Amino acid sequence: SLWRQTPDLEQLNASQKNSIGDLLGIRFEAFDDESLTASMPVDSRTHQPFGLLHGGASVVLAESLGSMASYLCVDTSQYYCVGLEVNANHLRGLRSGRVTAVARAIHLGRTTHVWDIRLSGDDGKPSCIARLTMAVVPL
Amino acid sequence: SLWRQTPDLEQLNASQKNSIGDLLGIRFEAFDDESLTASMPVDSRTHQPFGLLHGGASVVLAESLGSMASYLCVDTSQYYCVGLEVNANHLRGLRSGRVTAVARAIHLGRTTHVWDIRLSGDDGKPSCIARLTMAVVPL
């Protein structure tokens, strides 16, 4: 209901083929009227050299999730969306399991979208918070 | 000379084994007295679904580079460094070639480090700018 295109998790996941989301094991898991959820493994694909989840990989999950959320909110026959600005606080380290990100809208303007993205490990504790600004660009 | 540990590009690259840097093809390329440089391919490993460099992958390169820069600046027998906050402006899209990131220090404090990280594609034009805040934590 936030959504223009009704999210279809199969197509969301399928669309990742031959892109970093596929390579890192990102999976779109759920959605409702006001949020979209995706997760990613915490393993050697996403670790930094000390064996913790790479802070950048948290940002890949957040930008994948928010970029897809924007795509489901715009008129795709006339517009596409690109990342404009992203920021994140790294709150807790993760070593294994999966990290789950939930995106909610802060503002869907005509020319920019701002997304609130909350990540947590399998213990449910906040691990990262991101805010993503997307630009809406005419095709 | 910014550096405590003299950067050794072979060991920097070798240390990425079984981590996301290895998976994405990140390579530490150069250093001097005040900067450290690494690059990453722009291909299917790092694209988003529309065939452009994923904004998150830019952030992986930036955080890999800055995290390593911090590691070379602290007393590693007593401290380690973790990402605390990261932000980036996505300036231009890239489709192919490599993206090159250069890290310079803004502030190396006792408990935090702040890094300025500039990325550009092979045409030399700015593609992303990031600023990274690292926490210095006692072992």
Side-chain angles (χ1 to χ4, degrees), chain A residues 98-130:
Chain A
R98 297 184 68 82
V99 59
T100 301
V102 183
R104 288 168 182 104
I106 294 301
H107 181 230
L108 301 185
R110 302 161 89 191
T111 62
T112 61
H113 293 172
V114 180
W115 293 96
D116 169 74
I117 301 152
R118 308 294 181 92
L119 287 62
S120 55
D122 287 327
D123 60 13
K125 306 205 285 186
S127 61
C128 177
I129 176 170

PDB file of all heavy atoms in Angstrom, chain A residues 98-130:
ATOM      1  N   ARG A  98      22.577 -15.061  10.137  1.00  0.00           N
ATOM      2  CA  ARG A  98      22.210 -14.156   9.055  1.00  0.00           C
ATOM      3  C   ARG A  98      21.954 -12.793   9.655  1.00  0.00           C
ATOM      4  O   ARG A  98      21.730 -12.666  10.855  1.00  0.00           O
ATOM      5  CB  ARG A  98      20.957 -14.642   8.311  1.00  0.00           C
ATOM      6  CG  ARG A  98      21.125 -15.983   7.604  1.00  0.00           C
ATOM      7  CD  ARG A  98      19.883 -16.379   6.806  1.00  0.00           C
ATOM      8  NE  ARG A  98      19.651 -15.508   5.656  1.00  0.00           N
ATOM      9  CZ  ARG A  98      20.263 -15.640   4.486  1.00  0.00           C
ATOM     10  NH1 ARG A  98      21.166 -16.602   4.309  1.00  0.00           N
ATOM     11  NH2 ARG A  98      19.985 -14.806   3.495  1.00  0.00           N
ATOM     12  N   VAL A  99      22.011 -11.770   8.814  1.00  0.00           N
ATOM     13  CA  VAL A  99      21.611 -10.438   9.241  1.00  0.00           C
ATOM     14  C   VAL A  99      20.369 -10.059   8.445  1.00  0.00           C
ATOM     15  O   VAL A  99      20.329 -10.265   7.237  1.00  0.00           O
ATOM     16  CB  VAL A  99      22.761  -9.412   9.102  1.00  0.00           C
ATOM     17  CG1 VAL A  99      23.261  -9.313   7.666  1.00  0.00           C
ATOM     18  CG2 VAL A  99      22.341  -8.035   9.668  1.00  0.00           C
ATOM     19  N   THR A 100      19.355  -9.552   9.138  1.00  0.00           N
ATOM     20  CA  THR A 100      18.061  -9.249   8.529  1.00  0.00           C
ATOM     21  C   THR A 100      17.814  -7.745   8.525  1.00  0.00           C
ATOM     22  O   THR A 100      17.976  -7.081   9.548  1.00  0.00           O
ATOM     23  CB  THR A 100      16.936  -9.972   9.277  1.00  0.00           C
ATOM     24  OG1 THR A 100      17.181 -11.383   9.224  1.00  0.00           O
ATOM     25  CG2 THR A 100      15.578  -9.688   8.622  1.00  0.00           C
ATOM     26  N   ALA A 101      17.443  -7.208   7.367  1.00  0.00           N
ATOM     27  CA  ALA A 101      17.230  -5.773   7.233  1.00  0.00           C
ATOM     28  C   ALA A 101      15.760  -5.506   6.921  1.00  0.00           C
ATOM     29  O   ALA A 101      15.165  -6.204   6.104  1.00  0.00           O
ATOM     30  CB  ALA A 101      18.109  -5.227   6.118  1.00  0.00           C
ATOM     31  N   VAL A 102      15.175  -4.515   7.585  1.00  0.00           N
ATOM     32  CA  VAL A 102      13.804  -4.111   7.280  1.00  0.00           C
ATOM     33  C   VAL A 102      13.813  -2.655   6.823  1.00  0.00           C
ATOM     34  O   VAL A 102      14.352  -1.797   7.523  1.00  0.00           O
ATOM     35  CB  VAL A 102      12.910  -4.243   8.513  1.00  0.00           C
ATOM     36  CG1 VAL A 102      11.461  -3.886   8.161  1.00  0.00           C
ATOM     37  CG2 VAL A 102      13.003  -5.663   9.066  1.00  0.00           C
ATOM     38  N   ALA A 103      13.228  -2.387   5.655  1.00  0.00           N
ATOM     39  CA  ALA A 103      13.139  -1.017   5.130  1.00  0.00           C
ATOM     40  C   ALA A 103      11.751  -0.445   5.357  1.00  0.00           C
ATOM     41  O   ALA A 103      10.755  -1.120   5.100  1.00  0.00           O
ATOM     42  CB  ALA A 103      13.489  -0.983   3.646  1.00  0.00           C
ATOM     43  N   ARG A 104      11.701   0.798   5.836  1.00  0.00           N
ATOM     44  CA  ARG A 104      10.459   1.563   5.972  1.00  0.00           C
ATOM     45  C   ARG A 104      10.674   2.929   5.337  1.00  0.00           C
ATOM     46  O   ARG A 104      11.799   3.448   5.330  1.00  0.00           O
ATOM     47  CB  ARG A 104      10.100   1.730   7.452  1.00  0.00           C
ATOM     48  CG  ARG A 104       9.622   0.446   8.110  1.00  0.00           C
ATOM     49  CD  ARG A 104       9.557   0.568   9.623  1.00  0.00           C
ATOM     50  NE  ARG A 104       9.135  -0.694  10.239  1.00  0.00           N
ATOM     51  CZ  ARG A 104       9.950  -1.545  10.863  1.00  0.00           C
ATOM     52  NH1 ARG A 104      11.254  -1.284  10.968  1.00  0.00           N
ATOM     53  NH2 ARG A 104       9.463  -2.666  11.391  1.00  0.00           N
ATOM     54  N   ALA A 105       9.613   3.518   4.796  1.00  0.00           N
ATOM     55  CA  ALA A 105       9.738   4.831   4.167  1.00  0.00           C
ATOM     56  C   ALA A 105       9.751   5.972   5.169  1.00  0.00           C
ATOM     57  O   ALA A 105       8.963   5.993   6.120  1.00  0.00           O
ATOM     58  CB  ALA A 105       8.607   5.060   3.146  1.00  0.00           C
ATOM     59  N   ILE A 106      10.649   6.925   4.951  1.00  0.00           N
ATOM     60  CA  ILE A 106      10.647   8.164   5.715  1.00  0.00           C
ATOM     61  C   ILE A 106       9.944   9.240   4.892  1.00  0.00           C
ATOM     62  O   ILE A 106       9.115   9.997   5.396  1.00  0.00           O
ATOM     63  CB  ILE A 106      12.085   8.633   6.007  1.00  0.00           C
ATOM     64  CG1 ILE A 106      12.796   7.639   6.933  1.00  0.00           C
ATOM     65  CG2 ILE A 106      12.068  10.012   6.636  1.00  0.00           C
ATOM     66  CD1 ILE A 106      12.096   7.446   8.256  1.00  0.00           C
ATOM     67  N   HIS A 107      10.293   9.301   3.615  1.00  0.00           N
ATOM     68  CA  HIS A 107       9.717  10.289   2.712  1.00  0.00           C
ATOM     69  C   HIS A 107       9.840   9.824   1.273  1.00  0.00           C
ATOM     70  O   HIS A 107      10.939   9.535   0.803  1.00  0.00           O
ATOM     71  CB  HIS A 107      10.411  11.644   2.895  1.00  0.00           C
ATOM     72  CG  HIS A 107       9.858  12.734   2.025  1.00  0.00           C
ATOM     73  ND1 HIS A 107      10.656  13.543   1.240  1.00  0.00           N
ATOM     74  CD2 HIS A 107       8.584  13.153   1.824  1.00  0.00           C
ATOM     75  CE1 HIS A 107       9.894  14.408   0.587  1.00  0.00           C
ATOM     76  NE2 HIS A 107       8.638  14.204   0.935  1.00  0.00           N
ATOM     77  N   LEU A 108       8.708   9.762   0.573  1.00  0.00           N
ATOM     78  CA  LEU A 108       8.703   9.497  -0.860  1.00  0.00           C
ATOM     79  C   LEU A 108       8.310  10.778  -1.592  1.00  0.00           C
ATOM     80  O   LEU A 108       7.118  11.056  -1.781  1.00  0.00           O
ATOM     81  CB  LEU A 108       7.698   8.390  -1.179  1.00  0.00           C
ATOM     82  CG  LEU A 108       7.972   7.074  -0.455  1.00  0.00           C
ATOM     83  CD1 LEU A 108       7.014   5.996  -0.920  1.00  0.00           C
ATOM     84  CD2 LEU A 108       9.418   6.647  -0.690  1.00  0.00           C
ATOM     85  N   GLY A 109       9.301  11.573  -1.972  1.00  0.00           N
ATOM     86  CA  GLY A 109       9.048  12.832  -2.655  1.00  0.00           C
ATOM     87  C   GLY A 109       9.015  12.604  -4.154  1.00  0.00           C
ATOM     88  O   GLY A 109       9.188  11.469  -4.613  1.00  0.00           O
ATOM     89  N   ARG A 110       8.808  13.663  -4.932  1.00  0.00           N
ATOM     90  CA  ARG A 110       8.778  13.504  -6.391  1.00  0.00           C
ATOM     91  C   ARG A 110      10.137  13.179  -6.982  1.00  0.00           C
ATOM     92  O   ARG A 110      10.228  12.462  -7.977  1.00  0.00           O
ATOM     93  CB  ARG A 110       8.283  14.784  -7.073  1.00  0.00           C
ATOM     94  CG  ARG A 110       6.911  15.248  -6.662  1.00  0.00           C
ATOM     95  CD  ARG A 110       6.749  16.721  -7.036  1.00  0.00           C
ATOM     96  NE  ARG A 110       6.234  16.896  -8.386  1.00  0.00           N
ATOM     97  CZ  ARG A 110       6.193  18.060  -9.026  1.00  0.00           C
ATOM     98  NH1 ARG A 110       6.667  19.162  -8.451  1.00  0.00           N
ATOM     99  NH2 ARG A 110       5.689  18.122 -10.248  1.00  0.00           N
ATOM    100  N   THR A 111      11.195  13.734  -6.391  1.00  0.00           N
ATOM    101  CA  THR A 111      12.525  13.628  -6.985  1.00  0.00           C
ATOM    102  C   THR A 111      13.515  12.836  -6.116  1.00  0.00           C
ATOM    103  O   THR A 111      14.575  12.436  -6.598  1.00  0.00           O
ATOM    104  CB  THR A 111      13.119  15.021  -7.272  1.00  0.00           C
ATOM    105  OG1 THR A 111      13.264  15.734  -6.040  1.00  0.00           O
ATOM    106  CG2 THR A 111      12.196  15.824  -8.192  1.00  0.00           C
ATOM    107  N   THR A 112      13.168  12.624  -4.845  1.00  0.00           N
ATOM    108  CA  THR A 112      13.997  11.812  -3.930  1.00  0.00           C
ATOM    109  C   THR A 112      13.144  10.928  -3.006  1.00  0.00           C
ATOM    110  O   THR A 112      11.998  11.266  -2.692  1.00  0.00           O
ATOM    111  CB  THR A 112      14.920  12.680  -3.023  1.00  0.00           C
ATOM    112  OG1 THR A 112      14.107  13.535  -2.214  1.00  0.00           O
ATOM    113  CG2 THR A 112      15.883  13.518  -3.835  1.00  0.00           C
ATOM    114  N   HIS A 113      13.708   9.796  -2.582  1.00  0.00           N
ATOM    115  CA  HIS A 113      13.085   8.915  -1.596  1.00  0.00           C
ATOM    116  C   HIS A 113      14.077   8.751  -0.477  1.00  0.00           C
ATOM    117  O   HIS A 113      15.286   8.672  -0.728  1.00  0.00           O
ATOM    118  CB  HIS A 113      12.845   7.503  -2.142  1.00  0.00           C
ATOM    119  CG  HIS A 113      11.822   7.421  -3.227  1.00  0.00           C
ATOM    120  ND1 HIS A 113      11.604   6.263  -3.948  1.00  0.00           N
ATOM    121  CD2 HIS A 113      10.966   8.346  -3.729  1.00  0.00           C
ATOM    122  CE1 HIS A 113      10.656   6.479  -4.843  1.00  0.00           C
ATOM    123  NE2 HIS A 113      10.257   7.736  -4.735  1.00  0.00           N
ATOM    124  N   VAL A 114      13.578   8.691   0.749  1.00  0.00           N
ATOM    125  CA  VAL A 114      14.449   8.473   1.895  1.00  0.00           C
ATOM    126  C   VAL A 114      13.913   7.254   2.624  1.00  0.00           C
ATOM    127  O   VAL A 114      12.711   7.200   2.945  1.00  0.00           O
ATOM    128  CB  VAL A 114      14.457   9.704   2.825  1.00  0.00           C
ATOM    129  CG1 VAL A 114      15.386   9.467   4.036  1.00  0.00           C
ATOM    130  CG2 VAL A 114      14.875  10.967   2.039  1.00  0.00           C
ATOM    131  N   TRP A 115      14.798   6.276   2.875  1.00  0.00           N
ATOM    132  CA  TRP A 115      14.434   5.012   3.491  1.00  0.00           C
ATOM    133  C   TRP A 115      15.166   4.841   4.816  1.00  0.00           C
ATOM    134  O   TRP A 115      16.347   5.175   4.923  1.00  0.00           O
ATOM    135  CB  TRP A 115      14.782   3.829   2.570  1.00  0.00           C
ATOM    136  CG  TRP A 115      13.954   3.799   1.301  1.00  0.00           C
ATOM    137  CD1 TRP A 115      14.306   4.290   0.086  1.00  0.00           C
ATOM    138  CD2 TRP A 115      12.626   3.272   1.155  1.00  0.00           C
ATOM    139  NE1 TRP A 115      13.288   4.091  -0.820  1.00  0.00           N
ATOM    140  CE2 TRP A 115      12.240   3.478  -0.184  1.00  0.00           C
ATOM    141  CE3 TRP A 115      11.727   2.647   2.031  1.00  0.00           C
ATOM    142  CZ2 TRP A 115      10.984   3.077  -0.677  1.00  0.00           C
ATOM    143  CZ3 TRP A 115      10.474   2.254   1.540  1.00  0.00           C
ATOM    144  CH2 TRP A 115      10.120   2.477   0.198  1.00  0.00           C
ATOM    145  N   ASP A 116      14.441   4.312   5.793  1.00  0.00           N
ATOM    146  CA  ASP A 116      14.986   3.928   7.094  1.00  0.00           C
ATOM    147  C   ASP A 116      15.182   2.421   7.052  1.00  0.00           C
ATOM    148  O   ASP A 116      14.249   1.677   6.744  1.00  0.00           O
ATOM    149  CB  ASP A 116      14.000   4.324   8.198  1.00  0.00           C
ATOM    150  CG  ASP A 116      14.361   3.728   9.544  1.00  0.00           C
ATOM    151  OD1 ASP A 116      15.321   4.206  10.174  1.00  0.00           O
ATOM    152  OD2 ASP A 116      13.680   2.779   9.980  1.00  0.00           O
ATOM    153  N   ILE A 117      16.406   1.964   7.318  1.00  0.00           N
ATOM    154  CA  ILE A 117      16.718   0.546   7.182  1.00  0.00           C
ATOM    155  C   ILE A 117      17.358   0.043   8.476  1.00  0.00           C
ATOM    156  O   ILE A 117      18.392   0.556   8.909  1.00  0.00           O
ATOM    157  CB  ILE A 117      17.609   0.293   5.958  1.00  0.00           C
ATOM    158  CG1 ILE A 117      16.878   0.797   4.705  1.00  0.00           C
ATOM    159  CG2 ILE A 117      17.866  -1.213   5.797  1.00  0.00           C
ATOM    160  CD1 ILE A 117      17.766   1.238   3.576  1.00  0.00           C
ATOM    161  N   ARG A 118      16.712  -0.936   9.104  1.00  0.00           N
ATOM    162  CA  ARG A 118      17.161  -1.464  10.392  1.00  0.00           C
ATOM    163  C   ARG A 118      17.652  -2.899  10.235  1.00  0.00           C
ATOM    164  O   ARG A 118      16.932  -3.750   9.706  1.00  0.00           O
ATOM    165  CB  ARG A 118      16.018  -1.432  11.414  1.00  0.00           C
ATOM    166  CG  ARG A 118      15.319  -0.078  11.568  1.00  0.00           C
ATOM    167  CD  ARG A 118      16.243   0.970  12.159  1.00  0.00           C
ATOM    168  NE  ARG A 118      15.560   2.252  12.328  1.00  0.00           N
ATOM    169  CZ  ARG A 118      14.935   2.629  13.439  1.00  0.00           C
ATOM    170  NH1 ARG A 118      14.910   1.825  14.499  1.00  0.00           N
ATOM    171  NH2 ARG A 118      14.338   3.816  13.493  1.00  0.00           N
ATOM    172  N   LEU A 119      18.870  -3.174  10.705  1.00  0.00           N
ATOM    173  CA  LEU A 119      19.455  -4.513  10.593  1.00  0.00           C
ATOM    174  C   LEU A 119      19.655  -5.118  11.980  1.00  0.00           C
ATOM    175  O   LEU A 119      19.912  -4.400  12.958  1.00  0.00           O
ATOM    176  CB  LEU A 119      20.803  -4.498   9.840  1.00  0.00           C
ATOM    177  CG  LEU A 119      20.870  -4.285   8.321  1.00  0.00           C
ATOM    178  CD1 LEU A 119      20.326  -2.932   7.957  1.00  0.00           C
ATOM    179  CD2 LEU A 119      22.306  -4.378   7.811  1.00  0.00           C
ATOM    180  N   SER A 120      19.529  -6.441  12.061  1.00  0.00           N
ATOM    181  CA  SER A 120      19.775  -7.154  13.310  1.00  0.00           C
ATOM    182  C   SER A 120      20.240  -8.558  12.989  1.00  0.00           C
ATOM    183  O   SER A 120      19.847  -9.120  11.961  1.00  0.00           O
ATOM    184  CB  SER A 120      18.499  -7.216  14.154  1.00  0.00           C
ATOM    185  OG  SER A 120      17.425  -7.780  13.416  1.00  0.00           O
ATOM    186  N   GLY A 121      21.073  -9.123  13.865  1.00  0.00           N
ATOM    187  CA  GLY A 121      21.477 -10.508  13.729  1.00  0.00           C
ATOM    188  C   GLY A 121      20.405 -11.430  14.272  1.00  0.00           C
ATOM    189  O   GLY A 121      19.333 -10.984  14.697  1.00  0.00           O
ATOM    190  N   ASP A 122      20.689 -12.723  14.255  1.00  0.00           N
ATOM    191  CA  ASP A 122      19.686 -13.709  14.610  1.00  0.00           C
ATOM    192  C   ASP A 122      19.279 -13.629  16.077  1.00  0.00           C
ATOM    193  O   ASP A 122      18.250 -14.178  16.451  1.00  0.00           O
ATOM    194  CB  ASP A 122      20.174 -15.120  14.283  1.00  0.00           C
ATOM    195  CG  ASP A 122      20.186 -15.397  12.802  1.00  0.00           C
ATOM    196  OD1 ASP A 122      19.318 -14.859  12.073  1.00  0.00           O
ATOM    197  OD2 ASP A 122      21.066 -16.158  12.367  1.00  0.00           O
ATOM    198  N   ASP A 123      20.069 -12.949  16.903  1.00  0.00           N
ATOM    199  CA  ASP A 123      19.677 -12.766  18.302  1.00  0.00           C
ATOM    200  C   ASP A 123      18.658 -11.639  18.478  1.00  0.00           C
ATOM    201  O   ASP A 123      18.194 -11.393  19.590  1.00  0.00           O
ATOM    202  CB  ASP A 123      20.889 -12.539  19.207  1.00  0.00           C
ATOM    203  CG  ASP A 123      21.690 -11.310  18.824  1.00  0.00           C
ATOM    204  OD1 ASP A 123      21.197 -10.487  18.025  1.00  0.00           O
ATOM    205  OD2 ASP A 123      22.824 -11.168  19.330  1.00  0.00           O
ATOM    206  N   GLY A 124      18.331 -10.949  17.386  1.00  0.00           N
ATOM    207  CA  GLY A 124      17.330  -9.891  17.413  1.00  0.00           C
ATOM    208  C   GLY A 124      17.799  -8.512  17.846  1.00  0.00           C
ATOM    209  O   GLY A 124      17.024  -7.562  17.809  1.00  0.00           O
ATOM    210  N   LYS A 125      19.059  -8.387  18.254  1.00  0.00           N
ATOM    211  CA  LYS A 125      19.584  -7.101  18.704  1.00  0.00           C
ATOM    212  C   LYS A 125      20.000  -6.238  17.513  1.00  0.00           C
ATOM    213  O   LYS A 125      20.575  -6.757  16.555  1.00  0.00           O
ATOM    214  CB  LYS A 125      20.791  -7.319  19.622  1.00  0.00           C
ATOM    215  CG  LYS A 125      20.487  -8.250  20.802  1.00  0.00           C
ATOM    216  CD  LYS A 125      21.409  -7.988  21.987  1.00  0.00           C
ATOM    217  CE  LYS A 125      22.806  -8.526  21.772  1.00  0.00           C
ATOM    218  NZ  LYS A 125      23.631  -8.371  23.014  1.00  0.00           N
ATOM    219  N   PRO A 126      19.729  -4.919  17.572  1.00  0.00           N
ATOM    220  CA  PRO A 126      20.156  -4.015  16.487  1.00  0.00           C
ATOM    221  C   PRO A 126      21.651  -4.126  16.186  1.00  0.00           C
ATOM    222  O   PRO A 126      22.472  -4.043  17.113  1.00  0.00           O
ATOM    223  CB  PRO A 126      19.842  -2.632  17.057  1.00  0.00           C
ATOM    224  CG  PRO A 126      18.603  -2.885  17.918  1.00  0.00           C
ATOM    225  CD  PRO A 126      18.944  -4.205  18.601  1.00  0.00           C
ATOM    226  N   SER A 127      22.004  -4.308  14.915  1.00  0.00           N
ATOM    227  CA  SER A 127      23.412  -4.450  14.552  1.00  0.00           C
ATOM    228  C   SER A 127      23.903  -3.284  13.694  1.00  0.00           C
ATOM    229  O   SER A 127      25.096  -2.934  13.677  1.00  0.00           O
ATOM    230  CB  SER A 127      23.651  -5.783  13.845  1.00  0.00           C
ATOM    231  OG  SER A 127      22.918  -5.906  12.633  1.00  0.00           O
ATOM    232  N   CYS A 128      22.975  -2.694  12.956  1.00  0.00           N
ATOM    233  CA  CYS A 128      23.310  -1.568  12.101  1.00  0.00           C
ATOM    234  C   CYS A 128      22.007  -0.803  11.827  1.00  0.00           C
ATOM    235  O   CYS A 128      20.917  -1.399  11.788  1.00  0.00           O
ATOM    236  CB  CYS A 128      23.948  -2.089  10.802  1.00  0.00           C
ATOM    237  SG  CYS A 128      24.372  -0.860   9.548  1.00  0.00           S
ATOM    238  N   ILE A 129      22.110   0.518  11.711  1.00  0.00           N
ATOM    239  CA  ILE A 129      21.002   1.312  11.182  1.00  0.00           C
ATOM    240  C   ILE A 129      21.520   2.161  10.038  1.00  0.00           C
ATOM    241  O   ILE A 129      22.570   2.797  10.156  1.00  0.00           O
ATOM    242  CB  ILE A 129      20.324   2.225  12.243  1.00  0.00           C
ATOM    243  CG1 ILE A 129      19.238   3.100  11.589  1.00  0.00           C
ATOM    244  CG2 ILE A 129      21.353   3.082  13.006  1.00  0.00           C
ATOM    245  CD1 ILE A 129      18.386   3.819  12.620  1.00  0.00           C
ATOM    246  N   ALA A 130      20.770   2.181   8.939  1.00  0.00           N
ATOM    247  CA  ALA A 130      21.160   2.935   7.757  1.00  0.00           C
ATOM    248  C   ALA A 130      20.038   3.886   7.378  1.00  0.00           C
ATOM    249  O   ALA A 130      18.874   3.637   7.697  1.00  0.00           O
ATOM    250  CB  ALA A 130      21.470   1.987   6.589  1.00  0.00           C
TER     251      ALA A 130
END
